[PDB]
Structures are given as C-alpha cells and as structure tokens.
C-alpha cells in the first residue's frame, strides 16, 4: 500500500477523501525510496481512478489498430485535467468531475522512455516513433512523449506493458464539481505538489 497513512482513500465528486497534499508527500517519499519515479498526471473519471489506484492499471481491449493504444498521461496537470471527468452524461444529463492521478514507474523501466519533438498526431509520427523505440507500434514496455496534436503540451503514452507496472496514487490537485469541463485553475495546484513534480530525463 503506497498511499501512506490516514484513513480510507475514496474518490468522489466532493474531492478525494482522506487525501491531503501532506499525505501525498508521505506517499511520494515512500515510492521514491522503493525505487519509483513520477512520470506524469492522468485524468480520468472517478471509478477508473479508484480501479487504477487500488487495483492497478489494466488494459482491457482494442487490438485492431489502436496503434497508439496505451495509458495516456501528461507532465503538465492541465492537459490531464481536461480528461478528469465523465465522457458521457447519464440518463439525466449529468457529467461528473473526475480526478487527477499521479503515475509512478520503477526506475528500472526508465530505459524505455523516449521523447520526440514530432507531434504524435502527425501522419509520419508512427514511423518516427517506431524508429525511436526500435520496434513496430503498439508501445510495449516503453513510452513516448511528444506534443499533443494541437496545443503544444507534451503528452506521454505508456505502452500497456509499462502502464501495468505503474503504481498510481491520487493527486492533491482537485477537480472542480462546480466547473466540470472547465480548464485547470493553476492556483488550485498545491505548491507542495508542484515541488515533487519534476520529470525524469527521456531519450531522444
Ligand atoms: C475518456 N475520453 C477522453 C476517451 C479517451 O479515449 N481518452 C482518454 C482518457 C483519459 C485520459 N487521461 C489523461 O490524463 C490524459 C493525458 C494526456 C492525454 C490524454 C489523456 C486521456 C485520454
């Protein structure tokens, strides 16, 4: 259990229960001590956050193409935040805010991390990434970081094999239940979390 101590952690529209930036700090120190390193944020809906944190990352399907299939994260919490919410409404039109998660990978997995300046959405990106990674997509126990299709923000994709090796914990950066869909309010980012958010150096 890499969640540190305090009470039971629970995701909810009111905010991640029993999660404070201080507990995150304890959790972060424990992970680092165990040889894990932070690689980015992952925004998703509440239940997927719960599953990811306590069950671990688990690929489910889509092999025909989905060439870029994998676990998408981002060094910049603002990019991942856009995804921390339900993808479709319920029968009554409600779209709940989700949660931001912190993704860690064993340091021994770092050799598989690559970065390119080429926008991943570019048509020839696949060919360039395959050259960079040394094999045909999909990504395996490796990852690639590159500019989002449009926006300039760097997105990181973890091959499912790598993703399933991660330890993921809640972020102390909250989503706003009053502003679903809205952009991340940078002032809602705890200084203490920003402090433990440096990324590892990737190969290019
Ligand atoms: C949940 N819907 C957005 C459908 C989907 O297929 N994608 C998905 C679902 C969750 C995602 N979470 C992220 O943190 C993220 C970060 C950088 C780039 C993409 C993502 C991301 C993408």
Task: State the CATH number of the domain containing residue 127.
Answer: 3.90.175.10
- 20, 93, 128, 167, 180 from 12: Cα distances, Å: 14, 18, 40, 20, 13
46-53 long-range contacts, CB within 8 A, separation 24+? 46/11, 46/12, 46/13, 46/96, 46/98, 46/99, 47/11, 48/98, 49/11, 49/98, 49/99, 49/101, 49/170, 50/10, 50/11, 52/101, 52/168, 53/3, 53/9, 53/11, 53/101, 53/168, 53/169, 53/170
Angstrom distance (rounded) from CA 27 to CA 122: 37
Phi, psi of 170 (to 5 degrees): -65, 155
Q: Is 74 in the pocket of ligand 1 (CB under 6 A)?
A: yes
Q: What is the number of the ligand 1 atom nearest to the C-alpha of 156? A: 17
Active site residues: 155
Say if residue 51 carries a ligand binding annotation. Answer: yes
Q: What is the number of the ligand 1 atom nearest to the C-alpha of 41? A: 14
Residue located nearest, by CA, to atom 20 of ligand 1: 72
Burial of 152 per CB tally in 10 Å (0-12, 13-18, 19+): exposed
Residue 182: which domain range? Answer: 1-204
H-helix or E-strand containing 36? strand 36-44
H-helix or E-strand containing 132? helix 125-133
CA of 92 from ligand 1 middle (Å) equals 24
Helices (H), 136-188: 160-163
Q: Is 84 in the pocket of ligand 1 (CB under 6 A)?
A: no
Q: Is 73 in the pocket of ligand 1 (CB under 6 A)?
A: yes
Say if residue 44 carries a ligand binding annotation. Answer: yes
CA of 83 from ligand 1 middle (Å) equals 5
What's the domain count of the chain? 1
Experimental determination technique: X-ray
Q: Is 158 in the pocket of ligand 1 (CB under 6 A)?
A: no
Resolution limit, Å: 2.1
CA of 72 from ligand 1 middle (Å) equals 6
The answer to whether 159 and 141 are in contact (CB under 8 A) is: yes
């Amino acid at each position: 259990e890499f969640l540190g101590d305090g009470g039971d952690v629970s995701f909810s529209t009111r905010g991640t229960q029993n999660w404070t930036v201080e507990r995150l700090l304890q959790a972060h120190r424990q992970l680092e001590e165990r040889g894990y390193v932070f690689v980015g944020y992952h925004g998703t809906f509440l239940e997927a956050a719960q599953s990811i944190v306590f069950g671990g990352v688990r690929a489910r399907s889509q092999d025909l193409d989905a060439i870029w299939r994998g676990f998408y994260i981002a060094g910049d919490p603002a990019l991942a935040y856009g995804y921390a919410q339900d993808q479709e409404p319920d029968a009554r039109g409600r779209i709940r805010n989700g949660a931001l998660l912190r993704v860690y990978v064993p340091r021994s997995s770092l050799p598989g991390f690559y970065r390119t300046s080429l926008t991943l959405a570019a048509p020839e990106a696949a060919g360039e990434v395959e050259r960079l990674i040394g094999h045909p997509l999909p990504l395996r126990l490796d990852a690639i970081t590159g500019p989002e299709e449009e926006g300039g923000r760097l997105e990181t994709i973890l091959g499912w094999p790598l993703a399933e090796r991660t330890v993921v914990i809640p972020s102390a950066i909250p989503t706003d239940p009053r502003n679903v869909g809205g952009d991340l309010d940078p002032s809602s980012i705890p200084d203490k979390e920003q402090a433990i958010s440096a990324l590892p150096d990737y190969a290019s």
